[PDB]
Design a protein around this ligand. Structure first.
Ligand SMILES: [Zn+2]
Length: 248
């Protein structure tokens, strides 16, 4: 029949993926090798398509692939996987991909994912909080320009601030952190910005006379990023929820 016109159509389909800011086309050769025919219907070897999506996941998932970050004082460095990420839902994507390809019309798409944001754009744009552990300094960029910066005091050597791609998932005022040392601690805080799932976050360090330098090795935090009370207030007021926070 003319289901040939069909099979020829999907063989020429330009399938374009947009993932983490990168664009590429699915090679025609892969499409042709997926092209199958059964039950009198033109189709795609779902097993092969699923392997391809499983590969997209392993190659691009920001949940299992570190992020290249353009730091302020060191050029491009690698920031480990953090809490701010996404994962391609294999079965949903495979089905959506097949449907798209079988339709036989050129298309561009970003994968179906689960996480803190979709994959139709780069994980890190030009708005984020940068926490340089080596320099014990913090920057807040808004649309590509520093909107505020300041020295900070990260966690002490025993309870180090973990590196990774995090994000401000919540904002609380007059909160009260709690942890151990043993011997629990309280230490109330005027502004709390959790960026982790383990207690780590940004907050005013009222009880800290000096920030920056090597302070953390002496009077280091329990993991949080201690911030000068006055700065923290201005930060909190301008940092929107969902803002990425890179710690390296
Ligand atoms: Zn603390």
């Amino acid at each position: 029949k003319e289901q040939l016109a069909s099979m020829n159509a999907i063989a020429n389909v330009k399938a374009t993926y947009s993932i983490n800011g990168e664009t590429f086309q699915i090679p025609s050769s892969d499409i042709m090798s997926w092209l199958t025919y059964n039950d009198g219907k033109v189709d795609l070897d779902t097993e092969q398509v699923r392997q391809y999506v499983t590969d997209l996941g392993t190659k691009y998932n920001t949940s299992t692939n570190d992020t290249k970050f353009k730091s302020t004082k060191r050029g491009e460095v690698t920031v480990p996987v953090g809490t701010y990420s996404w994962t391609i839902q294999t079965d949903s994507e495979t089905e959506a991909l097949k449907k798209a390809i079988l339709a036989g019309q050129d298309f561009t798409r970003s994968p179906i994912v689960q996480g803190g944001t979709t994959a139709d754009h780069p994980l890190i744009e030009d708005t984020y909080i940068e926490v340089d552990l080596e320099n014990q300094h913090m920057w807040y960029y808004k649309d590509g320009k520093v909107a505020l910066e300041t020295d900070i005091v990260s966690g002490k050597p025993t309870t180090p601030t973990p590196a990774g791609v995090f994000y401000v998932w919540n904002k609380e005022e007059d909160a009260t952190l709690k942890g151990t040392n043993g011997t629990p601690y309280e230490s109330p805080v005027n502004y709390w910005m959790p960026i982790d799932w383990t207690g780590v976050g940004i907050h005013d360090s009222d009880w800290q006379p000096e920030y920056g330098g090597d302070l953390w090795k002496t009077r280091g935090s329990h993991g949080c990023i201690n911030t000068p009370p006055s700065v923290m207030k201005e930060l909190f007021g301008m940092v929107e929820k969902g803002t990425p926070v890179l710690v390296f």
